Structures are given as structure tokens and as C-alpha cells.
Coordinates of C-alpha atoms in Angstrom, one line a residue:
Chain A
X1 CA 129.2 118.8 103.4
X2 CA 126.5 115.9 104.9
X3 CA 125.8 112.7 103.1
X4 CA 121.8 112.2 103.3
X5 CA 119.7 108.9 101.0
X6 CA 119.0 111.8 97.8
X7 CA 116.6 111.0 95.3
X8 CA 116.1 112.1 92.2
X9 CA 113.8 115.8 91.4
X10 CA 110.6 114.4 90.1
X11 CA 109.1 117.2 88.0
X12 CA 109.7 116.0 84.9
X13 CA 107.7 112.8 86.0
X14 CA 105.0 114.3 87.7
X15 CA 103.6 115.6 84.5
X16 CA 103.5 112.1 83.2
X17 CA 101.4 110.0 85.7
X18 CA 97.8 109.6 84.5
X19 CA 95.0 107.6 86.1
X20 CA 93.8 104.9 84.4
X21 CA 91.0 102.8 84.7
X22 CA 89.6 99.9 82.9
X23 CA 85.9 98.9 84.3
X24 CA 85.7 98.8 88.6
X25 CA 90.3 99.0 88.9
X26 CA 91.7 102.3 89.4
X27 CA 95.8 102.6 89.0
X28 CA 98.4 104.8 87.4
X29 CA 100.0 105.4 84.0
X30 CA 102.8 106.9 82.3
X31 CA 102.2 109.1 79.3
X32 CA 104.8 109.6 77.4
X33 CA 103.9 111.1 74.0
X34 CA 100.9 109.4 72.9
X35 CA 101.0 106.4 74.5
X36 CA 100.1 105.5 78.1
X37 CA 102.1 102.8 79.9
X38 CA 100.5 101.1 82.4
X39 CA 100.7 97.3 84.2
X40 CA 98.0 94.9 82.3
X41 CA 96.6 93.5 85.5
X42 CA 94.2 96.6 85.1
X43 CA 91.8 94.7 83.2
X44 CA 91.4 92.1 85.8
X45 CA 89.0 92.3 88.8
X46 CA 89.4 91.0 92.4
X47 CA 89.0 87.8 91.7
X48 CA 90.5 87.1 88.4
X49 CA 94.5 87.7 89.9
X50 CA 93.5 84.7 91.4
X51 CA 94.6 82.8 88.3
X52 CA 94.5 85.1 85.3
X53 CA 93.9 84.5 81.3
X54 CA 95.1 88.1 80.3
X55 CA 94.7 87.1 77.0
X56 CA 91.0 85.9 76.9
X57 CA 90.4 88.9 79.6
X58 CA 91.8 91.7 76.6
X59 CA 89.2 90.0 74.1
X60 CA 86.4 91.4 76.4
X61 CA 88.1 94.8 76.7
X62 CA 87.2 98.1 74.1
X63 CA 89.2 100.9 73.4
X64 CA 86.8 102.6 74.7
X65 CA 86.7 101.0 78.0
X66 CA 89.7 102.4 78.6
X67 CA 89.3 106.1 80.9
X68 CA 92.6 107.6 81.2
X69 CA 92.6 111.3 82.9
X70 CA 95.2 113.2 83.3
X71 CA 94.2 115.5 86.1
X72 CA 90.9 117.2 84.3
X73 CA 91.5 116.5 80.9
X74 CA 90.5 113.1 79.4
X75 CA 92.0 111.2 76.4
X76 CA 90.7 109.0 73.5
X77 CA 91.9 105.6 73.5
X78 CA 92.6 105.0 70.1
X79 CA 95.0 101.6 70.3
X80 CA 95.3 99.1 72.8
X81 CA 98.1 96.6 72.8
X82 CA 99.7 94.1 75.3
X83 CA 103.7 94.2 75.1
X84 CA 104.6 91.3 77.9
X85 CA 103.5 92.4 81.6
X86 CA 102.1 96.2 80.3
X87 CA 99.2 97.7 78.3
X88 CA 100.5 99.3 75.4
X89 CA 97.5 102.5 75.0
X90 CA 98.0 104.7 72.0
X91 CA 95.9 107.8 72.5
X92 CA 94.7 110.7 70.7
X93 CA 96.6 114.0 72.4
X94 CA 100.5 114.0 73.1
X95 CA 101.9 114.9 76.2
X96 CA 103.0 118.3 75.3
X97 CA 105.4 117.9 78.8
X98 CA 106.6 114.9 77.0
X99 CA 111.0 115.2 78.6
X100 CA 113.4 113.1 76.9
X101 CA 113.3 109.8 78.4
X102 CA 114.5 106.5 77.5
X103 CA 113.8 103.1 79.0
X104 CA 116.8 100.6 80.3
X105 CA 116.6 97.7 82.3
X106 CA 118.6 98.1 85.2
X107 CA 120.9 95.4 87.0
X108 CA 120.9 94.7 90.8
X109 CA 122.4 96.5 93.0
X110 CA 121.2 100.1 91.1
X111 CA 119.4 102.2 92.7
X112 CA 116.6 104.7 91.4
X113 CA 113.8 107.4 92.2
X114 CA 110.4 105.8 93.1
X115 CA 107.3 108.5 92.7
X116 CA 104.8 106.8 94.5
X117 CA 101.8 107.9 93.3
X118 CA 97.6 107.7 93.4
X119 CA 95.0 107.9 91.4
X120 CA 97.3 109.5 89.3
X121 CA 98.4 112.4 91.1
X122 CA 102.2 112.1 92.9
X123 CA 102.7 111.5 96.8
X124 CA 105.8 111.0 97.4
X125 CA 109.6 110.9 96.5
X126 CA 112.2 108.1 98.0
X127 CA 115.2 106.6 96.7
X128 CA 115.9 102.4 96.7
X129 CA 118.0 99.9 95.2
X130 CA 117.3 96.2 93.2
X131 CA 117.8 94.1 95.6
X132 CA 119.7 90.9 94.3
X133 CA 116.7 88.9 94.6
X134 CA 114.9 91.6 91.9
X135 CA 112.4 92.9 94.8
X136 CA 112.2 96.1 96.4
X137 CA 111.6 97.4 99.6
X138 CA 109.3 99.7 98.7
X139 CA 106.7 101.9 100.2
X140 CA 103.6 101.1 98.5
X141 CA 100.1 100.9 99.6
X142 CA 97.0 99.4 97.6
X143 CA 96.4 102.0 94.1
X144 CA 100.3 102.7 93.7
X145 CA 100.3 100.2 90.6
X146 CA 101.6 101.6 87.6
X147 CA 104.0 104.2 89.9
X148 CA 107.5 104.2 88.2
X149 CA 111.2 103.8 89.1
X150 CA 113.5 106.4 87.2
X151 CA 116.7 108.6 87.6
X152 CA 117.7 111.1 85.4
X153 CA 121.3 112.3 83.4
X154 CA 121.2 116.1 83.2
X155 CA 118.2 116.6 80.4
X156 CA 116.9 112.6 80.0
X157 CA 114.8 111.2 82.3
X158 CA 115.7 107.3 82.4
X159 CA 112.5 104.9 83.3
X160 CA 113.4 101.7 84.8
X161 CA 110.9 100.3 86.8
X162 CA 106.9 100.1 87.1
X163 CA 105.4 98.7 90.4
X164 CA 103.3 95.8 90.1
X165 CA 102.6 93.8 93.0
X166 CA 103.1 92.9 96.4
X167 CA 104.7 90.1 97.6
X168 CA 102.8 88.0 101.0
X169 CA 105.8 89.0 102.4
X170 CA 105.5 92.8 101.7
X171 CA 108.5 93.5 99.6
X172 CA 107.6 94.5 96.0
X173 CA 108.4 93.3 92.6
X174 CA 107.8 95.2 89.5
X175 CA 108.5 94.9 85.5
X176 CA 110.8 97.3 83.1
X177 CA 108.7 99.5 80.5
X178 CA 108.9 97.2 78.5
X179 CA 106.5 94.5 80.3
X180 CA 109.5 92.2 81.8
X181 CA 109.1 91.1 84.8
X182 CA 112.5 91.8 87.3
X183 CA 113.0 88.6 88.3
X184 CA 111.2 84.7 88.2
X185 CA 108.1 87.1 89.3
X186 CA 104.3 86.8 87.6
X187 CA 101.3 89.0 87.8
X188 CA 99.0 86.7 89.6
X189 CA 98.4 86.6 93.4
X190 CA 99.9 83.6 94.8
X191 CA 102.2 82.4 96.6
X192 CA 105.8 83.5 95.1
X193 CA 108.7 83.2 97.4
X194 CA 111.9 85.3 97.3
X195 CA 115.5 84.1 97.4
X196 CA 118.1 85.3 99.6
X197 CA 118.0 89.0 99.8
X198 CA 122.3 89.6 100.1
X199 CA 124.5 92.8 100.7
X200 CA 125.5 94.8 97.8
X201 CA 129.2 94.6 98.9
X202 CA 130.4 97.4 95.9
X203 CA 127.7 100.0 97.7
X204 CA 129.3 99.5 101.2
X205 CA 132.8 100.3 100.2
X206 CA 131.0 103.6 98.6
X207 CA 129.1 104.5 101.6
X208 CA 132.6 103.8 103.6
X209 CA 134.2 106.3 101.1
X210 CA 131.8 108.7 101.8
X211 CA 132.4 108.8 105.6
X212 CA 135.8 108.9 105.3
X213 CA 135.3 112.0 103.2
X214 CA 132.6 113.5 105.9
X215 CA 135.0 112.9 108.3
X216 CA 133.9 109.6 109.9
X217 CA 137.0 107.6 110.4
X218 CA 137.7 105.6 113.1
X219 CA 137.2 102.1 111.1
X220 CA 139.9 103.0 109.3
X221 CA 142.2 99.9 110.8
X222 CA 146.0 99.0 110.1
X223 CA 145.7 95.6 107.9
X224 CA 145.2 95.0 104.3
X225 CA 143.9 92.6 102.7
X226 CA 142.8 89.9 99.0
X227 CA 140.2 90.2 96.8
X228 CA 140.3 85.9 97.6
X229 CA 140.5 86.2 101.6
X230 CA 137.7 88.8 101.3
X231 CA 134.9 87.3 99.5
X232 CA 135.8 84.2 101.8
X233 CA 134.4 86.1 105.0
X234 CA 131.7 87.9 102.8
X235 CA 130.3 84.8 101.5
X236 CA 130.3 83.7 105.1
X237 CA 127.7 86.7 106.0
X238 CA 126.2 86.6 102.8
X239 CA 127.4 89.5 100.6
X240 CA 127.6 89.2 97.4
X241 CA 131.9 88.5 96.2
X242 CA 133.2 91.4 95.4
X243 CA 134.8 91.3 91.4
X244 CA 137.6 92.9 89.4
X245 CA 135.5 94.9 87.7
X246 CA 133.9 96.4 91.2
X247 CA 137.3 97.4 92.5
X248 CA 137.6 99.7 88.3
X249 CA 134.4 101.6 89.7
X250 CA 135.1 102.6 93.1
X251 CA 138.9 104.0 91.2
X252 CA 138.2 107.6 91.9
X253 CA 136.8 107.1 94.9
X254 CA 140.4 105.6 95.8
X255 CA 142.0 108.4 94.3
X256 CA 139.7 110.7 96.1
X257 CA 141.0 109.7 99.9
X258 CA 144.0 108.0 99.0
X259 CA 143.0 104.4 100.1
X260 CA 143.4 101.5 98.7
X261 CA 140.2 99.5 97.6
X262 CA 141.8 96.6 99.5
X263 CA 142.5 98.0 102.5
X264 CA 139.0 99.7 102.7
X265 CA 137.8 95.9 102.6
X266 CA 140.2 95.2 105.3
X267 CA 137.9 97.5 107.4
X268 CA 134.7 96.0 106.2
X269 CA 136.8 92.7 106.8
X270 CA 137.2 94.5 110.6
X271 CA 133.8 95.1 110.7
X272 CA 132.1 92.0 109.3
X273 CA 133.5 89.8 112.1
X274 CA 134.1 92.0 115.3
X275 CA 130.1 94.6 114.4
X276 CA 130.3 98.4 115.4
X277 CA 130.8 97.9 119.3
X278 CA 127.2 100.2 119.7
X279 CA 129.2 103.4 117.2
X280 CA 127.8 104.9 114.1
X281 CA 128.9 105.4 110.7
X282 CA 127.6 108.2 109.0
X283 CA 124.6 108.6 111.8
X284 CA 123.6 104.8 110.7
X285 CA 124.4 101.6 113.5
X286 CA 124.0 99.6 110.6
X287 CA 125.7 99.0 107.1
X288 CA 124.4 100.8 104.2
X289 CA 124.1 99.3 100.7
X290 CA 121.6 101.5 98.9
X291 CA 124.4 103.4 97.3
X292 CA 125.6 103.3 94.5
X293 CA 129.7 104.8 93.9
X294 CA 127.7 106.7 90.9
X295 CA 125.0 108.5 94.0
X296 CA 128.2 109.1 96.2
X297 CA 130.6 111.0 93.9
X298 CA 127.4 112.4 92.5
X299 CA 126.1 114.0 96.0
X300 CA 130.4 114.6 97.1
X301 CA 130.3 116.8 93.9
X302 CA 127.2 118.9 93.6
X303 CA 126.0 116.8 89.7
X304 CA 123.3 119.2 89.1
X305 CA 120.1 118.5 85.8
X306 CA 117.8 119.7 83.8
Chain B
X1 CA 103.3 98.1 102.9
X2 CA 106.4 99.6 103.7
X3 CA 108.3 102.3 105.0
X4 CA 110.7 104.5 104.1
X5 CA 112.0 108.4 104.8
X6 CA 109.6 109.7 101.9
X7 CA 110.5 113.2 100.2
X8 CA 107.9 115.8 98.6
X9 CA 107.3 116.1 94.8
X10 CA 109.5 119.1 94.3
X11 CA 108.1 119.9 90.5
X12 CA 106.3 122.8 91.9
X13 CA 109.7 124.2 93.4
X14 CA 111.8 123.1 90.3
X15 CA 110.2 126.0 88.2
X16 CA 110.5 128.4 91.5
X17 CA 114.6 128.3 91.3
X18 CA 116.6 130.8 89.4
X19 CA 120.5 131.9 89.8
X20 CA 121.6 135.0 91.4
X21 CA 125.2 136.3 91.3
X22 CA 126.2 139.7 92.4
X23 CA 129.9 140.0 91.7
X24 CA 132.1 137.0 91.7
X25 CA 129.2 135.0 94.5
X26 CA 127.0 133.0 92.6
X27 CA 124.1 131.1 94.4
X28 CA 120.3 130.4 94.1
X29 CA 117.3 132.3 95.0
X30 CA 113.7 132.2 94.5
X31 CA 111.4 132.6 91.9
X32 CA 108.2 133.8 93.1
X33 CA 105.8 136.4 90.7
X34 CA 107.8 139.3 90.5
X35 CA 110.1 139.2 94.0
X36 CA 113.7 136.4 94.1
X37 CA 114.4 136.1 97.5
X38 CA 118.2 135.2 97.9
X39 CA 121.1 135.5 100.8
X40 CA 121.9 139.0 101.9
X41 CA 125.5 137.8 101.9
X42 CA 125.5 137.3 98.3
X43 CA 126.6 140.4 98.5
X44 CA 129.9 139.2 99.9
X45 CA 133.3 138.2 99.3
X46 CA 135.0 135.4 100.8
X47 CA 136.8 138.6 103.4
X48 CA 133.5 140.0 104.2
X49 CA 132.1 137.2 105.8
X50 CA 134.2 137.1 108.9
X51 CA 133.2 140.5 109.8
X52 CA 130.2 141.7 107.6
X53 CA 128.7 144.9 107.6
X54 CA 125.6 144.2 105.5
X55 CA 124.4 147.9 105.4
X56 CA 128.1 149.3 104.2
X57 CA 128.0 146.4 101.9
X58 CA 125.0 146.9 100.6
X59 CA 125.1 150.6 99.5
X60 CA 128.1 150.5 96.8
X61 CA 125.6 148.4 95.5
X62 CA 122.8 148.8 92.6
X63 CA 119.7 147.3 91.1
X64 CA 122.4 146.3 87.8
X65 CA 124.3 144.6 89.7
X66 CA 123.0 141.6 90.5
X67 CA 122.7 138.7 87.5
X68 CA 119.2 137.0 88.2
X69 CA 119.2 134.1 85.4
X70 CA 116.4 131.4 85.0
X71 CA 117.8 128.8 83.2
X72 CA 119.0 131.0 80.1
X73 CA 116.5 133.9 80.6
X74 CA 118.4 137.2 82.3
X75 CA 116.0 138.7 84.6
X76 CA 115.7 142.5 84.7
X77 CA 115.9 143.9 88.6
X78 CA 113.9 147.0 89.4
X79 CA 114.4 147.5 93.8
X80 CA 116.3 146.0 95.1
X81 CA 115.8 145.3 99.8
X82 CA 116.9 143.8 102.5
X83 CA 114.1 142.4 105.0
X84 CA 116.4 140.7 108.0
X85 CA 119.1 138.8 106.5
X86 CA 117.3 138.3 102.9
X87 CA 117.4 139.9 99.8
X88 CA 114.4 141.2 97.8
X89 CA 114.9 141.5 94.5
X90 CA 111.8 142.6 92.2
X91 CA 111.9 141.7 89.1
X92 CA 109.9 143.0 85.6
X93 CA 108.7 140.1 85.1
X94 CA 106.5 137.3 87.3
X95 CA 107.3 133.7 87.2
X96 CA 104.6 131.9 84.9
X97 CA 104.9 128.7 87.3
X98 CA 104.4 130.7 90.3
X99 CA 102.7 128.3 92.3
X100 CA 99.6 128.7 95.3
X101 CA 102.6 129.6 97.9
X102 CA 102.7 130.3 101.3
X103 CA 105.6 131.6 103.7
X104 CA 105.5 129.5 107.4
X105 CA 108.2 130.1 110.2
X106 CA 108.7 125.9 111.2
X107 CA 108.9 125.0 115.0
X108 CA 111.4 122.7 116.3
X109 CA 110.9 118.4 115.5
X110 CA 108.8 119.9 112.4
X111 CA 110.0 117.3 109.0
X112 CA 110.4 118.9 105.6
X113 CA 111.7 118.3 102.2
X114 CA 114.9 120.4 100.9
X115 CA 115.6 120.5 97.0
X116 CA 119.1 121.4 96.9
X117 CA 120.1 123.0 94.0
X118 CA 123.6 124.6 92.5
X119 CA 123.8 127.7 90.0
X120 CA 119.5 127.3 90.2
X121 CA 119.6 123.7 88.7
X122 CA 118.1 121.2 91.2
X123 CA 120.4 118.5 92.0
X124 CA 118.1 116.3 95.2
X125 CA 115.5 116.3 97.0
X126 CA 115.6 114.7 101.0
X127 CA 113.3 114.5 104.3
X128 CA 114.6 116.2 106.6
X129 CA 113.7 117.6 110.4
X130 CA 114.2 121.0 112.4
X131 CA 116.6 119.6 115.5
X132 CA 115.5 120.5 118.6
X133 CA 118.8 123.1 118.7
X134 CA 117.7 124.9 115.4
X135 CA 119.9 123.2 113.2
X136 CA 119.5 120.4 110.3
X137 CA 121.7 117.6 109.0
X138 CA 121.4 118.4 105.5
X139 CA 123.7 117.7 102.5
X140 CA 125.3 120.6 101.3
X141 CA 128.1 121.5 99.4
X142 CA 129.5 125.1 98.5
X143 CA 126.9 126.9 96.2
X144 CA 123.8 125.6 97.7
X145 CA 122.7 128.1 100.0
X146 CA 119.9 129.3 98.7
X147 CA 118.3 126.1 98.5
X148 CA 115.3 126.1 100.2
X149 CA 112.4 123.4 102.2
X150 CA 109.2 123.2 102.4
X151 CA 106.1 121.4 102.8
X152 CA 103.3 120.3 100.4
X153 CA 99.5 121.5 101.5
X154 CA 96.7 119.3 98.6
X155 CA 97.9 122.7 96.4
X156 CA 99.6 124.9 98.4
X157 CA 103.5 124.7 98.9
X158 CA 104.7 125.9 102.5
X159 CA 108.1 126.9 102.2
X160 CA 110.1 127.0 105.8
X161 CA 113.4 127.1 105.5
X162 CA 116.6 128.5 103.4
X163 CA 119.8 127.8 103.4
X164 CA 122.6 130.1 105.1
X165 CA 126.1 128.5 106.6
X166 CA 127.5 125.3 107.2
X167 CA 128.7 125.9 110.7
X168 CA 132.4 124.0 111.4
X169 CA 130.8 121.6 113.4
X170 CA 129.3 120.4 109.4
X171 CA 125.9 120.9 110.6
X172 CA 123.7 123.2 108.8
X173 CA 121.8 126.6 109.9
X174 CA 119.2 128.8 108.1
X175 CA 116.2 131.1 108.3
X176 CA 113.0 131.0 107.2
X177 CA 111.2 133.4 104.0
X178 CA 111.2 136.4 105.9
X179 CA 114.6 136.5 106.7
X180 CA 114.7 135.1 109.9
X181 CA 117.6 132.5 111.7
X182 CA 116.2 129.8 113.6
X183 CA 118.5 130.0 116.6
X184 CA 121.1 132.6 117.6
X185 CA 123.3 131.9 114.4
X186 CA 123.8 135.2 112.1
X187 CA 124.9 135.1 109.1
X188 CA 129.3 135.7 109.4
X189 CA 132.0 133.1 109.4
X190 CA 132.9 132.9 113.5
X191 CA 133.2 130.6 115.8
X192 CA 128.7 129.8 116.3
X193 CA 128.5 126.5 119.3
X194 CA 125.2 125.0 118.8
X195 CA 123.5 123.2 122.1
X196 CA 122.9 119.7 123.0
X197 CA 120.9 117.9 119.6
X198 CA 118.5 116.1 122.3
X199 CA 115.8 113.4 120.4
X200 CA 112.1 114.2 119.7
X201 CA 110.3 111.6 121.4
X202 CA 106.6 112.6 120.4
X203 CA 108.1 111.9 116.2
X204 CA 110.3 108.4 117.8
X205 CA 107.1 107.2 118.9
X206 CA 105.2 107.8 116.2
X207 CA 108.0 106.2 114.2
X208 CA 107.2 102.7 116.7
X209 CA 103.2 103.1 115.2
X210 CA 104.4 102.5 111.9
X211 CA 106.1 100.2 112.7
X212 CA 103.7 98.1 114.1
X213 CA 101.3 98.9 111.3
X214 CA 103.7 97.1 109.3
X215 CA 104.6 94.0 111.4
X216 CA 106.9 94.5 113.8
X217 CA 105.6 94.1 117.5
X218 CA 109.0 92.6 118.8
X219 CA 109.3 96.1 121.3
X220 CA 105.7 96.0 122.8
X221 CA 105.5 94.7 126.3
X222 CA 103.9 94.1 128.8
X223 CA 104.1 97.3 131.2
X224 CA 102.8 100.6 131.2
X225 CA 104.0 103.9 132.6
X226 CA 103.0 107.4 133.6
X227 CA 103.5 110.8 132.1
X228 CA 106.5 111.9 134.4
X229 CA 107.7 108.5 135.1
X230 CA 108.7 108.7 131.6
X231 CA 109.9 112.2 131.3
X232 CA 112.2 111.2 134.4
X233 CA 113.5 108.5 131.6
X234 CA 113.8 110.3 128.9
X235 CA 115.6 113.3 130.2
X236 CA 118.4 111.2 131.9
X237 CA 119.1 110.1 128.0
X238 CA 118.4 113.4 126.2
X239 CA 115.3 112.9 125.0
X240 CA 112.7 116.0 124.8
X241 CA 110.3 116.1 127.2
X242 CA 106.7 114.4 126.8
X243 CA 103.5 117.0 126.9
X244 CA 99.9 116.4 126.7
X245 CA 99.7 118.3 123.5
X246 CA 101.5 115.6 122.2
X247 CA 99.4 112.4 123.8
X248 CA 96.7 114.1 121.5
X249 CA 98.8 114.2 117.9
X250 CA 99.4 110.9 118.9
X251 CA 94.8 109.8 119.7
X252 CA 94.6 108.3 116.0
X253 CA 97.6 106.7 115.6
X254 CA 96.7 105.4 119.1
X255 CA 93.2 104.4 118.0
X256 CA 93.7 102.9 114.7
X257 CA 96.8 100.6 116.3
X258 CA 94.3 99.4 120.0
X259 CA 97.4 100.6 121.7
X260 CA 97.9 103.6 124.2
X261 CA 100.1 106.2 124.0
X262 CA 101.2 105.6 127.7
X263 CA 101.5 101.8 126.4
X264 CA 103.8 102.6 123.6
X265 CA 105.9 105.1 126.2
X266 CA 106.0 102.0 128.5
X267 CA 107.4 100.3 125.2
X268 CA 110.2 102.6 124.7
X269 CA 111.2 103.4 128.2
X270 CA 112.4 99.5 128.1
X271 CA 114.2 100.6 124.6
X272 CA 116.3 102.6 125.8
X273 CA 117.2 101.2 129.0
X274 CA 117.5 98.1 128.1
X275 CA 118.3 99.3 124.5
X276 CA 118.1 97.3 121.2
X277 CA 120.0 94.1 121.1
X278 CA 120.5 93.8 117.8
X279 CA 117.5 93.6 117.1
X280 CA 115.7 96.3 114.3
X281 CA 112.9 98.0 113.8
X282 CA 111.2 99.2 110.2
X283 CA 115.1 97.6 109.0
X284 CA 117.1 100.1 111.5
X285 CA 119.4 99.7 114.3
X286 CA 118.1 102.8 115.9
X287 CA 115.3 105.4 117.0
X288 CA 114.7 107.2 114.6
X289 CA 113.1 110.4 115.2
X290 CA 113.0 112.5 111.8
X291 CA 108.9 111.3 111.1
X292 CA 105.7 113.2 112.4
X293 CA 102.7 111.9 113.8
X294 CA 101.7 113.4 110.2
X295 CA 104.1 112.3 108.2
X296 CA 103.2 108.6 109.1
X297 CA 99.6 109.0 108.6
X298 CA 100.4 110.0 105.0
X299 CA 102.0 107.6 104.4
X300 CA 100.3 105.0 105.6
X301 CA 97.4 106.3 104.0
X302 CA 98.4 107.3 100.1
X303 CA 97.6 111.1 100.9
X304 CA 98.2 112.9 97.5
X305 CA 98.6 116.3 96.0
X306 CA 98.3 118.4 93.2

């Protein structure tokens, strides 16, 4: 038993992290096959970030201007191209540690593991979620750019996030592995405002199911509710509205615990109005929304990977 | 910026996990060099656990009774010995992926990363702490026995925990890599009661320092206090008493933020009495004690590893 904020094993990603240097800037890159992916603002100086013209900055760069280093082995750049907001440096050597990988663009509310790196060297791993405003609440310092978020399906590594910038508000924004930013953000140092950071209601319900599995049942009440009457209360507290698709995803958890989705909603509705009265749920005094229904199933059933 | 419950990269440990089977029981093992370490209750049946005599059970076992499997490669057991509560199965093949490792016995309050495994296959990684009652609040299912806790110092992997059993209360107990249990626990299925689970005060202070670094300062008050007057209030709330050694460890954090240790204690003392009044600190409505002062420095400065 027990429930922890669990990340995926990062071994298969550690062997793909390299150090990319272009001029004075040095950040991390993702070495898969004979291509290295990195944020395109590696070609910028501290002054260029205020208003960069990436097309013009890239003209004055040649293949021999990029220093790709894997530990102590130097990679030779044979060709460079800019796809959206990422650079694709084609190197001469393929990565022998290239795993069965895949590029995926996730939706808000999904979770993934982040491997924070500095100078191509791994520093730590943690789990987080794509907020509804397309930001993530991560832990990044200067030089962490190029760190990647990923999930694992048995033996396949699904890359879904590359870190690009920290907003003046302390939250983090990045792109998929094709160079398309999540949200309306751009890679320049300017005041960019994010929207309302709502709570991922479907994730909260999955977390309450995990609590019942582990013995916490005090929040179970005698009431029920309707999908509409719940969303009416949810919107008032800046909670994402619940749809029928969300009910279908919670089906397995409903079957294992013997508690209907709408009944669990009635317990949550009560919690949203009356609070938690100093009690805790799974050792937390707040409602957690960084576990998806799949995360709960995976952790409460012991799913392994290559 | 930002602050996350960060675990160490598990790549160097993934390559050391194997599957150990003896009769009907199958659990995980740690393959370092030509030796495989695993819990000794792998030789027990479900009935033997109620009152096992490990000496007598081990006599009826030969080297060819243990099935050590690394992925799809079979290991040959050449010699077995029982050191305290762990079995040391000497195999014929040395692990080519053996990292610079080290066995260490940690003290209560220290933190480490856990690699939860099933059938020798990694499942997830999370960070946790050795509670003052020598238990850990982990996430383990049946078959997770043999999973290891570890830290990383640059290129050296320090193994400090092996999981053995789940207590009837839902908490977890295990041994160091020499087979000595943490706490007064034994590897048999019987009612074992743990003591008072107090709060690790030194870790809470380190966490408050991390908050100030990241912009949360509302808890900073105008008071101060003495080491004795604080411990008087701490003991009332089941907090570990603070010693001078703890003050010395918080020195660097005191220098970076410009806030004296005793002043931060005065802020904590206030929080312990008046509560948090619905406010949060680093996104938490409770006082966190699973970050050591070293963890905070490491995450707020970007320490990398091999």
C-alpha cells in the first residue's frame, strides 16, 4: 500500500542527453539517432533575447559553430535546420543508446516525468502535469533549458516536452519535440501573461479513488449529484468542467472500489464547499490534481517497464 | 526557480536489478559485481512467514534452487550465504553495468530515492525520508520486496535501504545492504508496533529557507527566540528537538538568505501555535519535513551527477 508522487525511471533518457554550445550559450540537447534536438535560442546572446530575429541570427551560424558534446566524446555537426522553435543538428554518429522513442503532443491535464539536466548531465527527476493554461510548475535553474519531459509505455519512450523559458511569474513554458510551444508563448524575453490556472477535476477524482483504496474514507458522504449540478459548483471554484469522457475514464476505478463516479463527485462537491476541516487525505491538506486516472491504476497495480 | 520533490536519476540502479526466484516466491535482487543481494525471506512460503526459522529453511536449499534472471539472461549460482537478513548469492558472471557503488547505513531524517521494482523490472522512482521511528512512508505492492533506496554523489551510488515488509499499519520497514534492519523490526509476519512518528524539525527549517528563496516570505515574523525556548514548544507538537549540530548544517542557507537560524525558528514557532490560516508555503498547506538542508542546496544550485 501507500501512494507517492512517482516518476518514470529515467535510465533510457539519461543516455540521450548531450551538451550543446553555440558561442557563449550552453544548454542541453536530446540526441536520438544522428539528430540532436535543442532550443533554438541557443544561438542568442543575453541581449538578443529581448527581441530576437531567429532567421537572421541563424544565417551567421555554420555547422562548425555548434559544439555538441556527449560526456567527453565530441560530435560533428553535418547539417542544421530550424523546425519551429527547435534546432535539428544532424551529427555524424548515431547514438548507440537510442531507445524505441516517439514524439507526442500531450493535452492539458496529462502528466509526465521531467529529467532536469545541466551541461548535458542529469540532475534529478520529478513528476508534474501540464496545467490548463499550458504552463508547468517545475523546478528549473539557469542552464536547464533543453531538459525533456517524457512518459514510458513498456519499452517505448514518449517525448512530449522540452523546456525553453521561465516566465516572470516563476512558471515554466516549453514546446513539444517538433518545436511548437504549448500555449500562446514565444521564445523571447518579454512580459508574457498566462491565463487562469484552474484545477484538473478529473485528476482530483482519480486521487480520491486512490485514497479509498489506501484506507482514507472519511470524505465519503451519503449524498449524490448530477453532472450538471456538480459543474455548476465546480466552475465557481475554478475547477475544470467534467464531461462524459471523463466519466468513462474513471470507470475502472469505479468498478474496483464499488463507488459510482457521480457519488464521488458528491463527496468532492461537499469538500469544495465545507473544506477539509484540518483533516488530510493521503497525507495532504489540499486536493491533488497531478495524478491522472492512469497514474493511479499504474501505481495501485504495479505496471513495469523495460 | 520552483521547488519539487526531486529524486535522483535511476539509470545507474536500473542496470543492477534482477529477478530472484526460490520455489514459489519471486522478488527483486541487487546485482553488483558477481554477488546478488536479496531479502532472505525469499526462501519462505506464505505459511513460513508466521514463524520462520531461517537457519533450518536454508539447509534444505542448494545453489541450484535459486533462479536469478537478468532480463532474459540466466545467472548461475555458485555459492550462497546468509548475512543477517539478506542472502548473498555469488554468481558466475559479474555485472558489466556495475557502477562505483557503496554501502551506507543512514540515520533517521535523511532522505533517499526509491526505485520500486517488480519481477526485476523498474516501475517508478520517488523520494522519501527515514522517519524517526525507522519506518518509511513508501509506495509498495506485493512483489516489490528487494527494491533498493539509494543516493548519488557525483559518480558514486550509495545504497542505503532494501525493502523487506509492510507493517499492518501500512508503513514500510527494511534493512541496510548488510542485512541489519532499521529499527526494532524483524522479518516475520507478526504484529509489530512502531513508535511515535515525530516531525524532522531540521528538515522543516531547510524547507522554509527554500520557500524564502522562491518568493514565499509571508511567514517571516518580527520575533526571535532561543534554542531552549523553541525546543520547549517543539516537544509539545511532537517535533524533533533541535541541537547545535542542526544549526551548523543550516549555516549556508542562513548566509544565502540573510536570515538567522534562530529567527527562522521564531517564525516556525509562530506557525506551530497559530497554524497557517489557510495559506500555503511552496504550494503546500502542511509543513514539509522530507527535504534535508543538502537537498535544498542541491536543488537551488543545480548539482549534477555522472
